[PDB]
Amino acid sequence: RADRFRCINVGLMPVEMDPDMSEKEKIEFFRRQEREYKRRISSARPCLLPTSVHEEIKDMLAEQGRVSARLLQKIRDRVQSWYHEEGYACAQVVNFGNLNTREVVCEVVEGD
Amino acid sequence: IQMTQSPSSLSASVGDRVTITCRASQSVSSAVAWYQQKPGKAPKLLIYSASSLYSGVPSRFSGSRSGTDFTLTISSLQPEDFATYYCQQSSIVWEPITFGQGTKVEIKRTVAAPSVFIFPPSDSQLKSGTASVVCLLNNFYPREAKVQWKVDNALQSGNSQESVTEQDSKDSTYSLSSTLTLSKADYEKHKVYACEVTHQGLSSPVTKSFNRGEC
Amino acid sequence: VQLVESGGGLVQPGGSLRLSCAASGFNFYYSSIHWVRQAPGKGLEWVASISSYYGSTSYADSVKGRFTISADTSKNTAYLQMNSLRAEDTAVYYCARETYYTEFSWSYSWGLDYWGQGTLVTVSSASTKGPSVFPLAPSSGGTAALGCLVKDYFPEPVTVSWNSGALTSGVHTFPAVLQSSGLYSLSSVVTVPSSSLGTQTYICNVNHKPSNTKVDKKVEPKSC
Hints:
Helix content of chain B: under 10%
Number of strands of chain A: 4
Protein name (chain A): Protein TOC75, chloroplastic
Organism (chain A): Pisum sativum
Transmembrane segments (chain A): 8-13
Oligomer: heterotrimer
Helix content of chain A: 40-55%
Strand content of chain B: over 45%
Subcellular location (chain A): Plastid, Chloroplast outer membrane
Chloroplast intermembrane side (chain A): 14-112
């Protein structure tokens, strides 16, 4: 499910759904979300997260070969742990996205 | 995570306001759906996102959320609304879905006495198909009713099975069958077979009977 | 938009069975397919789900390891392979569609909006038996009751109609009951005007597919 991992710093960053969306409108909502997440990745900056921690996350993904809420929680804990141990006290993993693709994207606000 | 519905069952009359609650247990959520299921039929989606009415569902159904407590409200209870209603949670990252235990909604209506019929074992059945005697209580309310089998005025216990239809979609009444089962030998060692019925709508219990052989 | 379950039937304990769910009318790559079961006299139990959009599968703990959910996206079909079946797995299995979006922080579901008609899975070492149909003749105001008794069949279900479905008003088909013999029995009755007893023909049509039994029984008053 998850062969790739990306971490992006997105400081600025939830959708109030339309009430009686048709089938075509649901499809267009999914397409809109994909396109906007592409733009969000493109305009965001790479994380300070060093290569070794990236390899640790890659190993966590390769061990299960399938993403789940518990795995995303463990990845969040690892990333936040590195950030807080490095001196970025208000660093926070705010989301994971692009879950429909082979590449899990981790969103962090670094602060400090 | 658990979904705890309340009450387990309830009874209300046509036109009443019915409320069913459902608490998400051991986690917050936001995606709660409500479903209506008739017995032995596929459930029908009533509400999604805890407030959104699904396509075609009458507007007397409504939903609301207060933290981890979700409420399904039926405003003007109609006779066709008898059903088991379920809440259901859909959490993040395709986590397992959970259904509530369900709330059974029955329609309360005015008392109606059953019409009683008795059916002897078929004259085309007695060849090795033994003896089945059927007592029918038709279109009554409430569901509670006592059916006693007397064979030669002897109360026979342990050899009858009851079965009740679901509440009628128009008049909210029930129908009930009682089946007395006897071997071919035991049936012919007795003459009078009677079904006695006690029910709230009957001022006195009503007996229906036949005599074996005398058609 | 329609979902059709197939593949249910009678299987011995520890056996295996593959159910299929053909879902036509939407874009399979954007909706999840769920299997939800209902045991006799019990509530709905979610069994498993597969999302083609997120490429994921999920299972309830009660079936993890025994059941495998899968999908043939080209055929628009989902599958539930059930291994090591137990008596407690006896149930009606439905498949349902759910449009579902998720991130880590939030998600959105449009509910299980489309459901199949369901297929019965019976897990028992008991063997199949066909049903015996007996008349419940009208005997001896202005309304008479008559019916059919369907006895000694296994497994469920049987279906009963009157006059090949032309007669529906006043019909009551009772739920099957489990006799001590291990087999099922039920009755179907109808009330008709008394005068019609000599002018109208009444036939009950019973169908038990598991044993491939199809019976048409005319019910007349007994001429003493």
